[PDB]
Amino acid sequence: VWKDADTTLFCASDAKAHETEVHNVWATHACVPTDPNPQEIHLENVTENFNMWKNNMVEQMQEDVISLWDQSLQPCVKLTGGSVIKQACPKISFDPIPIHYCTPAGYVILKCNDKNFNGTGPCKNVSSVQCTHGIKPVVSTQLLLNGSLAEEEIIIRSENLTNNAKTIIVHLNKSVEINCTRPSNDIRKAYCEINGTKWNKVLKQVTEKLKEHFNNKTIIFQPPSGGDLEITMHHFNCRGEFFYCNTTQLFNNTCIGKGCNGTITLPCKIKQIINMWQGTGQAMYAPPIDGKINCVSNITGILLTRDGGANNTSNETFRPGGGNIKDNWRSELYKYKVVQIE
Amino acid sequence: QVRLSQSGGQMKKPGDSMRISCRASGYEFINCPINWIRLAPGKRPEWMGWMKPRGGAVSYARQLQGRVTMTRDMYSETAFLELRSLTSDDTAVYFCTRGKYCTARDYYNWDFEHWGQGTPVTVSSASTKGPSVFPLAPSSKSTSGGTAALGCLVKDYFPEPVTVSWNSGALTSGVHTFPAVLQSSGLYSLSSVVTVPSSSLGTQTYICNVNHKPSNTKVDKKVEPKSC
Amino acid sequence: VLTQSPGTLSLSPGETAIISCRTSQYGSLAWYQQRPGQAPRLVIYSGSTRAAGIPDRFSGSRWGPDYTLTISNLESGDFGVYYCQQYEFFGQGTKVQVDIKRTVAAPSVFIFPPSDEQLKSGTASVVCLLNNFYPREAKVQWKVDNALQSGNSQESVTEQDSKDSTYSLSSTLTLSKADYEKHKVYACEVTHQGLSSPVTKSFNRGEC
Ligand SMILES: *[C@@H]1O[C@H](CO)[C@@H](O)[C@H](O)[C@H]1NC(C)=O
Ligand SMILES: *[C@@H]1O[C@H](CO)[C@@H](O)[C@H](O)[C@H]1NC(C)=O
Ligand SMILES: *[C@@H]1O[C@H](CO)[C@@H](O)[C@H](O)[C@H]1NC(C)=O
Ligand SMILES: *[C@@H]1O[C@H](CO)[C@@H](O)[C@H](O)[C@H]1NC(C)=O
Ligand SMILES: *[C@@H]1O[C@H](CO)[C@@H](O)[C@H](O)[C@H]1NC(C)=O
Ligand SMILES: *[C@@H]1O[C@H](CO)[C@@H](O)[C@H](O)[C@H]1NC(C)=O
Ligand SMILES: *[C@@H]1O[C@H](CO)[C@@H](O)[C@H](O)[C@H]1NC(C)=O
Ligand SMILES: *[C@@H]1O[C@H](CO)[C@@H](O)[C@H](O)[C@H]1NC(C)=O
Ligand SMILES: *[C@@H]1O[C@H](CO)[C@@H](O)[C@H](O)[C@H]1NC(C)=O
Ligand SMILES: *[C@@H]1O[C@H](CO)[C@@H](O)[C@H](O)[C@H]1NC(C)=O
């Protein structure tokens, strides 16, 4: 017999004490070695309720990632609170590693294994584990990179699709690579490449899944309505550099309605002056490193917001979302919940 | 204590743009979304959109898509609303609002406990148009044992208001001047009536006096029984 | 999606106001009050949960899709306009205004054909007057050659008279001069509590 509860989880990883890489260094001092032979116990005749939007595991992951970033990605100048802080800002090795979250004694993690689970409600096949799978703390907006894929069908996730203030997470069942590059020899200019054939076919599948949730209305995509660059563009960190990519071409309604078939190339720019995602102010970093900067990632999900208003048309509008990085963790922690044994 | 202070009201012509501000205090500004709701008399309250201070994320109502813009200033904790291409339909009182439930971890946007004091915005043409005054004739036969109704119709004027007196204000008993209605043409119209003894229709003269200050118009109209 | 009923509520202090809202989807429904010249105020949220400062005289209930706000023992600070809300959607509003009670008085109904002066302008306005009645509730229907009219009429009602506590209503039917000359019989039908049956005043175009 158990009950839902919240406790201080501990971290596990496969960090290398010899690595200078930032996540490895953090995990060395913050985490413990992983388990070679994990234990999972499947529970039949047991039905449990889950709610990915009220899962406090997310809150703890959020603190760690903030701590990791704040103690690693140090700016040259920090502008917050109307004051000026000048520090040292050396270039770093940056590439996220998988992180497992685990429960102490008396607590256990319950895991939903329903292949079509949408994040809230009851689950039929529940297993009992001590640790989650290896989750990479990838910080991004609009697109979810390098995450886990949905088992069966594309899954739409929202605390409440009626509430246009609630984020929508689209969980893909087939990843699509995005190939971002800052070539050697403007040093701040970059670009991302995506296979238009793969992407548009997935995007077509996304609209058809949404139709199931919105009474077969016409599904339309639009660019973000406004906000800081971190949300109006696809924002992410590659090799320690802050990238901002324009995703207008990624959501082409014409290609999901001839010629669109090919290689899509998004314009990007590496910024040195960014808004601190600690909800504070502006941080200033050094120019990018010389040579070809490159990262190939899996697009495994999409963050969306749906338009509202007192209207009366048979078409819904969706826009690339983001901003709240806690949603990035929700998308990986959705099948987990902490219970306390007796 | 949560407070929302809005800027002062203003008047605009059709075609102009407007900007209004909402200064927030009493709570952690970046935690909660801010909404804008406008209210016009006779009409359903209309949600315009919300804005989340942290990254300035915004969601605009479909019917306002393209004309509206919401921003914020972090230092002064002030939210801003811009509305462009104004017309008569934008005449209303504009409110900023924030939901009752707000924590660092969670919120509910739509239970609006907190409202600003409101910013009235009028959008109208500077043009004026004087009223047409038509007689509402009593009847044809005189009944020496009853009361007769008469009045004048005051049609197609802009803007408000018009006033009506009778016999230069010497006739007040049984007078009814109705609230004006807004017609499809965009022009106002009202009626003024009065009940009098039918036995005085051949003796007393009844004149309605209509005043429309915006157009500098004063019209007197004698209302008398039709000839047939 | 949100159908608030009715439109205007005319009550005396001490009485109870019953305001209802029919929704098409279930979910957190809120009620707001707007006093004259003041910003709206959250009265009830989540169907029946009373907000801060709100007296237990206010109560929310729900039967099927019908949400109801009842205000017992009306005070001066209760009168105004009330709105229901679900997410970003609002109801049309319910105006709750002060009514001073008196004996029932049937209206006196007059009808005025279009002026000959106005008929030289291409437009025709027919005016129906309901004079000095109580209670305020009244229905007016226009008929043109025994055909129910709709979408071409506007009504106006006076404030309750400070001397005799009655109301007066004006209804105007507007037609083009051409369309007006097409028909003969023009009638307004009046139904009111003080009338044993609906009263119809009418006239025939051309004849005096
Ligand atoms: C739960 O297990 C059943 C029985 O083996 C299996 O058929 C099914 O795939 C599981 N449920 C879901 C929703 O996948
Ligand atoms: C990217 O996806 C492929 C399959 O789609 C997988 O083999 C690979 O491990 C993924 N890379 C990650 C998760 O970093
Ligand atoms: C992914 O899900 C879609 C339905 O949303 C389905 O059409 C498609 O076949 C799936 N792809 C797989 C299982 O590889
Ligand atoms: C998820 O499934 C549950 C089943 O109880 C349902 O109530 C909920 O609306 C679903 N959510 C979405 C986003 O489809
Ligand atoms: C990524 O794009 C670059 C050119 O920008 C290309 O040379 C490279 O082969 C691509 N990488 C992959 C894995 O496709
Ligand atoms: C895009 O992907 C398809 C497979 O889905 C592949 O056959 C094609 O060569 C790719 N196009 C380019 C330009 O790489
Ligand atoms: C994104 O790129 C498109 C390119 O067509 C451009 O129209 C749009 O203004 C850009 N948006 C931002 C926020 O830079
Ligand atoms: C969308 O796709 C079509 C097809 O290639 C192209 O002609 C058009 O210019 C594209 N527009 C945007 C905004 O991506
Ligand atoms: C995703 O993982 C690959 C290696 O699997 C790495 O090269 C890439 O930089 C990662 N992307 C991000 C955005 O961290
Ligand atoms: C959706 O929102 C309503 C209130 O609007 C709430 O009562 C309900 O529990 C929510 N549903 C879920 C699955 O969270």
Side-chain angles (χ1 to χ4, degrees), chain A residues 93-138:
Chain A
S93 181
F94 186 102
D95 206 345
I97 59 172
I99 296 296
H100 304 250
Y101 281 90
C102 328
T103 44
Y107 298 81
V108 185
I109 295 174
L110 294 190
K111 172 180 184 186
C112 179
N113 310 121
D114 282 355
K115 300 298 181 299
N116 55 341
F117 185 60
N118 71 22
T120 58
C123 181
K124 187 61 179 182
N125 305 315
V126 186
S127 65
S128 173
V129 290
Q130 180 183 357
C131 284
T132 71
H133 65 287
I135 295 180
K136 287 189 286 293
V138 180

Short mmCIF file of all heavy atoms in Angstrom, two decimals, chain A residues 93-138:
data_model
loop_
_atom_site.label_atom_id
_atom_site.label_comp_id
_atom_site.label_asym_id
_atom_site.label_seq_id
_atom_site.Cartn_x
_atom_site.Cartn_y
_atom_site.Cartn_z
N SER A 93 33.49 23.19 -22.87
CA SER A 93 33.01 22.00 -23.55
C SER A 93 31.58 21.74 -23.07
O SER A 93 31.35 21.61 -21.86
CB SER A 93 33.92 20.81 -23.26
OG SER A 93 33.46 19.65 -23.94
N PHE A 94 30.64 21.67 -24.01
CA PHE A 94 29.21 21.61 -23.66
C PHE A 94 28.49 20.58 -24.54
O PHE A 94 28.42 20.73 -25.76
CB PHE A 94 28.57 23.00 -23.81
CG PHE A 94 27.13 23.08 -23.35
CD1 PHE A 94 26.82 23.64 -22.12
CD2 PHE A 94 26.09 22.63 -24.16
CE1 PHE A 94 25.50 23.73 -21.70
CE2 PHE A 94 24.77 22.71 -23.74
CZ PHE A 94 24.48 23.27 -22.50
N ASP A 95 27.95 19.55 -23.90
CA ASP A 95 27.15 18.54 -24.55
C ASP A 95 26.42 17.70 -23.48
O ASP A 95 27.05 16.93 -22.75
CB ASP A 95 28.03 17.64 -25.43
CG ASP A 95 27.24 17.01 -26.58
OD1 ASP A 95 25.99 17.04 -26.54
OD2 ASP A 95 27.88 16.60 -27.57
N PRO A 96 25.09 17.85 -23.40
CA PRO A 96 24.29 17.23 -22.34
C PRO A 96 24.39 15.71 -22.29
O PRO A 96 24.41 15.05 -23.34
CB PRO A 96 22.86 17.66 -22.70
CG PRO A 96 23.05 18.90 -23.52
CD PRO A 96 24.27 18.65 -24.32
N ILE A 97 24.47 15.15 -21.09
CA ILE A 97 24.49 13.71 -20.90
C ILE A 97 23.20 13.23 -20.24
O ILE A 97 22.50 14.01 -19.60
CB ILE A 97 25.71 13.27 -20.06
CG1 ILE A 97 25.67 13.93 -18.69
CG2 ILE A 97 27.01 13.58 -20.79
CD1 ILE A 97 26.72 13.40 -17.74
N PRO A 98 22.88 11.93 -20.39
CA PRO A 98 21.64 11.43 -19.78
C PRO A 98 21.68 11.45 -18.24
O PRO A 98 22.69 11.09 -17.62
CB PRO A 98 21.54 10.00 -20.32
CG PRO A 98 22.39 9.99 -21.55
CD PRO A 98 23.52 10.92 -21.25
N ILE A 99 20.57 11.86 -17.65
CA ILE A 99 20.46 11.95 -16.20
C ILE A 99 19.27 11.14 -15.67
O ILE A 99 18.13 11.34 -16.12
CB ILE A 99 20.30 13.42 -15.76
CG1 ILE A 99 21.54 14.23 -16.12
CG2 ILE A 99 19.97 13.51 -14.29
CD1 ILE A 99 22.80 13.80 -15.39
N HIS A 100 19.52 10.23 -14.74
CA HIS A 100 18.45 9.46 -14.11
C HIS A 100 18.04 10.07 -12.77
O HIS A 100 18.90 10.38 -11.95
CB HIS A 100 18.88 8.01 -13.88
CG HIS A 100 19.34 7.30 -15.11
ND1 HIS A 100 18.61 6.29 -15.70
CD2 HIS A 100 20.47 7.43 -15.85
CE1 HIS A 100 19.26 5.84 -16.76
NE2 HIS A 100 20.39 6.51 -16.87
N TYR A 101 16.74 10.22 -12.54
CA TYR A 101 16.27 10.62 -11.22
C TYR A 101 15.68 9.43 -10.46
O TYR A 101 14.92 8.63 -11.01
CB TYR A 101 15.26 11.76 -11.32
CG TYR A 101 15.93 13.10 -11.54
CD1 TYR A 101 16.18 13.56 -12.83
CD2 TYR A 101 16.34 13.88 -10.47
CE1 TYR A 101 16.81 14.78 -13.03
CE2 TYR A 101 16.96 15.10 -10.67
CZ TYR A 101 17.20 15.54 -11.95
OH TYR A 101 17.82 16.75 -12.16
N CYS A 102 16.07 9.31 -9.19
CA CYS A 102 15.75 8.13 -8.38
C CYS A 102 15.20 8.49 -7.01
O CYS A 102 15.42 9.59 -6.50
CB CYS A 102 16.99 7.26 -8.20
SG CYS A 102 18.15 7.27 -9.58
N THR A 103 14.50 7.54 -6.40
CA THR A 103 13.89 7.73 -5.09
C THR A 103 14.72 7.07 -3.99
O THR A 103 15.33 6.02 -4.21
CB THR A 103 12.46 7.15 -5.06
OG1 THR A 103 12.45 5.87 -5.71
CG2 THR A 103 11.49 8.07 -5.78
N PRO A 104 14.75 7.69 -2.80
CA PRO A 104 15.39 7.13 -1.60
C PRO A 104 14.61 5.96 -1.01
O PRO A 104 13.66 5.47 -1.63
CB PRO A 104 15.42 8.31 -0.62
CG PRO A 104 15.17 9.52 -1.46
CD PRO A 104 14.28 9.06 -2.56
N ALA A 105 14.99 5.53 0.19
CA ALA A 105 14.29 4.45 0.87
C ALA A 105 12.88 4.87 1.26
O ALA A 105 12.63 6.04 1.58
CB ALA A 105 15.06 4.02 2.11
N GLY A 106 11.94 3.93 1.21
CA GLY A 106 10.56 4.20 1.56
C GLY A 106 9.74 4.80 0.44
O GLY A 106 8.52 4.86 0.51
N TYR A 107 10.42 5.26 -0.61
CA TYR A 107 9.74 5.84 -1.76
C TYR A 107 10.04 5.01 -3.01
O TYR A 107 11.12 4.43 -3.13
CB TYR A 107 10.16 7.30 -1.97
CG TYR A 107 9.80 8.21 -0.81
CD1 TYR A 107 10.61 8.27 0.32
CD2 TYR A 107 8.67 9.01 -0.86
CE1 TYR A 107 10.29 9.10 1.38
CE2 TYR A 107 8.34 9.84 0.20
CZ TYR A 107 9.15 9.88 1.31
OH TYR A 107 8.84 10.71 2.37
N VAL A 108 9.08 4.94 -3.92
CA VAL A 108 9.24 4.20 -5.17
C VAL A 108 8.65 5.03 -6.30
O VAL A 108 7.74 5.82 -6.08
CB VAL A 108 8.55 2.82 -5.11
CG1 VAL A 108 8.82 2.03 -6.37
CG2 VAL A 108 9.02 2.03 -3.91
N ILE A 109 9.19 4.87 -7.51
CA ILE A 109 8.62 5.51 -8.69
C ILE A 109 7.69 4.56 -9.43
O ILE A 109 8.06 3.43 -9.74
CB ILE A 109 9.72 5.99 -9.67
CG1 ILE A 109 10.58 7.08 -9.05
CG2 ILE A 109 9.10 6.50 -10.96
CD1 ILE A 109 11.78 7.48 -9.91
N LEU A 110 6.47 5.01 -9.70
CA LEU A 110 5.55 4.22 -10.52
C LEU A 110 5.62 4.70 -11.96
O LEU A 110 5.67 5.90 -12.22
CB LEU A 110 4.12 4.32 -9.99
CG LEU A 110 3.87 3.71 -8.61
CD1 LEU A 110 2.37 3.66 -8.30
CD2 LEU A 110 4.50 2.33 -8.52
N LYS A 111 5.62 3.75 -12.89
CA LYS A 111 5.80 4.06 -14.31
C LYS A 111 4.65 3.52 -15.16
O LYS A 111 4.34 2.33 -15.12
CB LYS A 111 7.13 3.47 -14.79
CG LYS A 111 7.37 3.55 -16.29
CD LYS A 111 8.73 2.94 -16.64
CE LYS A 111 9.05 3.10 -18.12
NZ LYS A 111 10.30 2.39 -18.49
N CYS A 112 4.04 4.41 -15.93
CA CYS A 112 2.96 4.02 -16.83
C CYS A 112 3.52 3.45 -18.14
O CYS A 112 4.35 4.08 -18.79
CB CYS A 112 2.04 5.20 -17.13
SG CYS A 112 0.70 4.80 -18.27
N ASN A 113 3.05 2.26 -18.51
CA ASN A 113 3.52 1.61 -19.73
C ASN A 113 2.44 1.49 -20.81
O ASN A 113 2.59 0.74 -21.77
CB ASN A 113 4.07 0.22 -19.41
CG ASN A 113 5.06 0.25 -18.27
OD1 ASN A 113 4.86 -0.41 -17.24
ND2 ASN A 113 6.14 1.03 -18.43
N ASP A 114 1.35 2.24 -20.64
CA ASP A 114 0.33 2.33 -21.67
C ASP A 114 0.87 3.05 -22.91
O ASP A 114 1.30 4.21 -22.83
CB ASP A 114 -0.91 3.06 -21.14
CG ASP A 114 -1.78 2.17 -20.26
OD1 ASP A 114 -1.46 0.96 -20.14
OD2 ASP A 114 -2.78 2.67 -19.70
N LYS A 115 0.84 2.37 -24.05
CA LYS A 115 1.49 2.86 -25.26
C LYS A 115 0.83 4.11 -25.84
O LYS A 115 1.43 4.81 -26.66
CB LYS A 115 1.52 1.76 -26.33
CG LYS A 115 2.27 0.49 -25.93
CD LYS A 115 3.74 0.77 -25.66
CE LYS A 115 4.49 -0.50 -25.28
NZ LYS A 115 3.96 -1.12 -24.04
N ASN A 116 -0.40 4.38 -25.42
CA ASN A 116 -1.15 5.53 -25.93
C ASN A 116 -1.45 6.56 -24.84
O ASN A 116 -2.35 7.38 -24.98
CB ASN A 116 -2.45 5.07 -26.57
CG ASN A 116 -3.29 4.24 -25.62
OD1 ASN A 116 -2.78 3.71 -24.64
ND2 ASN A 116 -4.58 4.12 -25.92
N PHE A 117 -0.69 6.50 -23.74
CA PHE A 117 -0.95 7.36 -22.60
C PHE A 117 -0.71 8.83 -22.94
O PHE A 117 0.32 9.17 -23.52
CB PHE A 117 -0.09 6.95 -21.41
CG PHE A 117 -0.38 7.72 -20.16
CD1 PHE A 117 -1.65 7.68 -19.60
CD2 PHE A 117 0.60 8.47 -19.54
CE1 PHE A 117 -1.93 8.39 -18.45
CE2 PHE A 117 0.32 9.18 -18.39
CZ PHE A 117 -0.95 9.13 -17.85
N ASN A 118 -1.64 9.70 -22.57
CA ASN A 118 -1.53 11.08 -23.02
C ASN A 118 -1.02 12.04 -21.95
O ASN A 118 -0.88 13.24 -22.20
CB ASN A 118 -2.87 11.56 -23.57
CG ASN A 118 -3.94 11.75 -22.50
OD1 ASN A 118 -3.65 11.92 -21.31
ND2 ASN A 118 -5.19 11.72 -22.93
N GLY A 119 -0.76 11.52 -20.75
CA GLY A 119 -0.20 12.34 -19.69
C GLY A 119 -1.09 12.51 -18.47
O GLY A 119 -0.58 12.69 -17.36
N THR A 120 -2.41 12.49 -18.66
CA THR A 120 -3.32 12.55 -17.52
C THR A 120 -4.32 11.40 -17.55
O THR A 120 -4.62 10.85 -18.61
CB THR A 120 -4.09 13.88 -17.48
OG1 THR A 120 -4.81 14.07 -18.70
CG2 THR A 120 -3.11 15.03 -17.29
N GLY A 121 -4.83 11.04 -16.38
CA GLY A 121 -5.82 9.99 -16.27
C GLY A 121 -5.25 8.68 -15.75
O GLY A 121 -4.10 8.63 -15.33
N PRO A 122 -6.06 7.62 -15.78
CA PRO A 122 -5.67 6.29 -15.30
C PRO A 122 -4.75 5.55 -16.26
O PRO A 122 -4.77 5.80 -17.47
CB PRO A 122 -7.01 5.56 -15.17
CG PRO A 122 -7.86 6.19 -16.21
CD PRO A 122 -7.46 7.65 -16.25
N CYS A 123 -3.95 4.64 -15.72
CA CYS A 123 -3.06 3.82 -16.53
C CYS A 123 -3.23 2.35 -16.14
O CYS A 123 -3.34 2.03 -14.95
CB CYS A 123 -1.61 4.27 -16.36
SG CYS A 123 -0.40 3.35 -17.35
N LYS A 124 -3.25 1.46 -17.13
CA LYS A 124 -3.51 0.04 -16.85
C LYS A 124 -2.23 -0.75 -16.52
O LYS A 124 -2.18 -1.45 -15.51
CB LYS A 124 -4.23 -0.60 -18.04
CG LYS A 124 -4.69 -2.02 -17.78
CD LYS A 124 -5.68 -2.09 -16.63
CE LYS A 124 -6.17 -3.52 -16.40
NZ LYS A 124 -7.19 -3.61 -15.31
N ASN A 125 -1.20 -0.63 -17.36
CA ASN A 125 0.05 -1.35 -17.10
C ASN A 125 1.06 -0.47 -16.38
O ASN A 125 1.78 0.30 -17.01
CB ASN A 125 0.65 -1.90 -18.39
CG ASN A 125 -0.33 -2.76 -19.16
OD1 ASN A 125 -1.01 -3.61 -18.59
ND2 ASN A 125 -0.41 -2.54 -20.47
N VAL A 126 1.09 -0.61 -15.06
CA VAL A 126 1.98 0.17 -14.22
C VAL A 126 3.13 -0.70 -13.73
O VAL A 126 2.90 -1.79 -13.21
CB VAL A 126 1.24 0.77 -13.02
CG1 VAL A 126 2.15 1.70 -12.23
CG2 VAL A 126 -0.02 1.49 -13.48
N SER A 127 4.36 -0.23 -13.91
CA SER A 127 5.50 -0.96 -13.37
C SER A 127 6.16 -0.18 -12.24
O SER A 127 5.96 1.03 -12.09
CB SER A 127 6.52 -1.27 -14.47
OG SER A 127 7.11 -0.10 -14.99
N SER A 128 6.93 -0.89 -11.43
CA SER A 128 7.59 -0.30 -10.27
C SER A 128 9.10 -0.22 -10.48
O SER A 128 9.77 -1.25 -10.56
CB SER A 128 7.28 -1.10 -9.02
OG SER A 128 8.03 -0.63 -7.92
N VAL A 129 9.63 1.00 -10.55
CA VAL A 129 11.06 1.20 -10.70
C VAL A 129 11.63 2.10 -9.61
O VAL A 129 10.89 2.74 -8.88
CB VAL A 129 11.41 1.81 -12.07
CG1 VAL A 129 11.16 0.80 -13.19
CG2 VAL A 129 10.61 3.08 -12.30
N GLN A 130 12.95 2.14 -9.52
CA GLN A 130 13.62 3.02 -8.58
C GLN A 130 14.12 4.28 -9.28
O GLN A 130 14.16 5.35 -8.67
CB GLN A 130 14.79 2.30 -7.90
CG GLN A 130 15.54 3.17 -6.90
CD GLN A 130 16.73 2.46 -6.28
OE1 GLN A 130 16.98 1.28 -6.55
NE2 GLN A 130 17.48 3.17 -5.45
N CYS A 131 14.48 4.16 -10.55
CA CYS A 131 15.01 5.29 -11.31
C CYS A 131 14.26 5.48 -12.62
O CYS A 131 13.68 4.54 -13.16
CB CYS A 131 16.50 5.09 -11.60
SG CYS A 131 17.61 5.40 -10.20
N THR A 132 14.28 6.70 -13.14
CA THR A 132 13.75 6.97 -14.47
C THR A 132 14.76 6.54 -15.51
O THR A 132 15.88 6.13 -15.18
CB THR A 132 13.44 8.46 -14.67
OG1 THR A 132 14.67 9.20 -14.76
CG2 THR A 132 12.59 9.01 -13.53
N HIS A 133 14.38 6.65 -16.78
CA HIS A 133 15.35 6.45 -17.86
C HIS A 133 16.31 7.64 -17.90
O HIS A 133 16.12 8.63 -17.20
CB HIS A 133 14.63 6.28 -19.21
CG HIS A 133 13.90 7.51 -19.66
ND1 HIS A 133 12.72 7.93 -19.08
CD2 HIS A 133 14.17 8.39 -20.65
CE1 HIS A 133 12.30 9.03 -19.68
NE2 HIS A 133 13.16 9.33 -20.64
N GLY A 134 17.35 7.52 -18.72
CA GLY A 134 18.35 8.57 -18.84
C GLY A 134 17.82 9.76 -19.62
O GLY A 134 17.61 9.67 -20.83
N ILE A 135 17.61 10.87 -18.92
CA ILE A 135 17.03 12.07 -19.52
C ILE A 135 18.10 13.14 -19.76
O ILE A 135 18.82 13.52 -18.84
CB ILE A 135 15.91 12.64 -18.63
CG1 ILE A 135 14.74 11.65 -18.56
CG2 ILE A 135 15.42 13.99 -19.15
CD1 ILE A 135 13.61 12.14 -17.70
N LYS A 136 18.19 13.62 -20.99
CA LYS A 136 19.13 14.68 -21.31
C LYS A 136 18.51 16.05 -21.04
O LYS A 136 17.43 16.35 -21.55
CB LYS A 136 19.60 14.57 -22.77
CG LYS A 136 20.56 13.41 -23.00
CD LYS A 136 21.18 13.43 -24.39
CE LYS A 136 20.19 13.01 -25.46
NZ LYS A 136 19.81 11.57 -25.34
N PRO A 137 19.18 16.88 -20.23
CA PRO A 137 18.68 18.21 -19.88
C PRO A 137 18.77 19.22 -21.01
O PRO A 137 19.30 20.31 -20.83
CB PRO A 137 19.58 18.63 -18.71
CG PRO A 137 20.82 17.83 -18.90
CD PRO A 137 20.38 16.52 -19.46
N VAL A 138 18.23 18.86 -22.17
CA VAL A 138 18.31 19.74 -23.33
C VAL A 138 17.39 20.95 -23.19
O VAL A 138 16.16 20.80 -23.17
CB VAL A 138 17.95 19.00 -24.62
CG1 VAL A 138 18.04 19.93 -25.80
CG2 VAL A 138 18.89 17.81 -24.81
#
